[PDB]
């Protein structure tokens, strides 16, 4: 069992920045990788970014690459999503996710079903 | 007069991942192998160097009990002279191995409903293990021309991977618990003897 | 990837004798436990006999104890099965089998990696 709580979503102008946190609680020694997903209203969920808990290596979807930084604090049991140069396409509900599953190919974490999900935090990117 | 603690090894509630396999030194005790002989439900029970009919008539300077979990299909690799992910990168027996290999299906214990992904194996290694070598390193593996610097990507891989033990899995993808008894003989007092 | 080839099969009189041979490819026959299994019409593969590395423990199925003798010649990479006082119940295909390991469960076909295609023995009356 683990519980995931997203925070730091809300309103921002396109070209600006936001920092999502997600706090992991429960059997935390079990985290293999973390992910961020997003889902705009009425469109299918999409993979955003994954980080291997041991090592800290990141995989990103092509749509956010070079704009977004995934990172984690093993000590504080928390994964971060640094969203810079926000665009209209970014607007969506963001979910963090945890898997206890070790995959050799970090890219697997784009397509691989995660074990636990947050309730989500809403992000909204203004028409200036 | 005190029996060797084979129970501690075989009946252990938790088992090791094969990559980080476990050793129990067994010495200064009577080895009654009848505890093994009277199990009809091991899937394999093979000895190398000694006939299993002689185990109760034999003495050793020590016994080592290596234990871990692998998939069904991989149990044939826990033998002298085998190759494959397990033999090559996880657990290697010597060609002149003297001891026994015992395995049994553990689907009942080692698969939960969500699937059990805790057991890992090593998928990539710069070279094969020497016999009884054990590598628990998580060095990013450099597959290609270019170096990694502990960062993952193209031809730069995490060396370990979960077994996925789902209760739906076919036999070959079901977990097996393995115990390898290595009979060590030295120019030293025999501290592990059968009941003759 | 040892290959095994049985021979000596054919027709024989009840009460008669017959020696099967099995030759293993490779140069490691010394380190292989050799076994004979058989399959009679409408039945499973049945254990007949096995021989450890030294020859020093041999094993036999209940039906063949007394009558059948297993032996090995490492020089010729050959295991033998001398069948004496043959009964109609002995009619079957005889499969040679081999493994690096000697099994406590020596009658289990699953405990042997390597298998011949089999020689046919037929016993008449
Ligand atoms: C493990 O426990 C079983 C009973 O659950 C017992 O039959 C068996 O002898 C024990 N195994 C060993 C090696 O002590």
Residue numbers in the entry:
A (entry chain F): 1 to 128
B (entry chain A): 333 to 528
C (entry chain B): 1 to 125
Study text:
To develop an understanding of the structural basis of nanobody binding affinity, we carried out the biophysical and structural characterization of a series of six nanobodies targeting the receptor binding domain (RBD) of SARS-CoV-2 spike protein, comprising a hit from screening a naïve nanobody library and five affinity-matured mutants derived from this parental binder; two of the mutants have been shown to be potently neutralize the virus. Recognition of the RBD by the nanobodies is dominated by CDR3 and CDR2, with CDR1 only making a few contacts. At the heart of the interaction of these nanobodies with the RBD is a salt bridge π–cation interaction involving R52 from CDR2 of the nanobody and E484 and F490 of the virus RBD. As a result of binding to this epitope, the nanobody directly competes with the binding of angiotensin-converting enzyme 2 (ACE2) and thus is neutralizing.
Since the resolution of the cryo-EM maps precluded a detailed analysis of the interactions, we carried out crystal structure determination of all nanobodies bound to RBD. When the F2 nanobody was present (necessary to obtain crystals), this was bound remotely from the epitope of the H11 nanobodies. Analysis of the superposition of the RBD suggests that F2 has no systematic effect on the RBD structure in contact with the H11 nanobodies, consistent with previous observations. In H11, the side chain of R100 (H11-A10 S100, H11-H6 K100, H11-H4 H100) makes several contacts with RBD. In H11, the water molecule appears to be missing, although this may be a feature of data resolution. Analysis of the H11 structure revealed that the configuration of the π–cation salt bridge deviated from this ideal. This prompted us to examine the interaction in all the structures and the data show a trend where H11 is least optimal, with H11-H4, closely followed by H11-D4, having the most optimal arrangement. The “parent” nanobody, H11, binds the most weakly, having a much lower binding enthalpy than the other nanobodies. This is consistent with a poorly optimized π–cation interaction with the RBD.
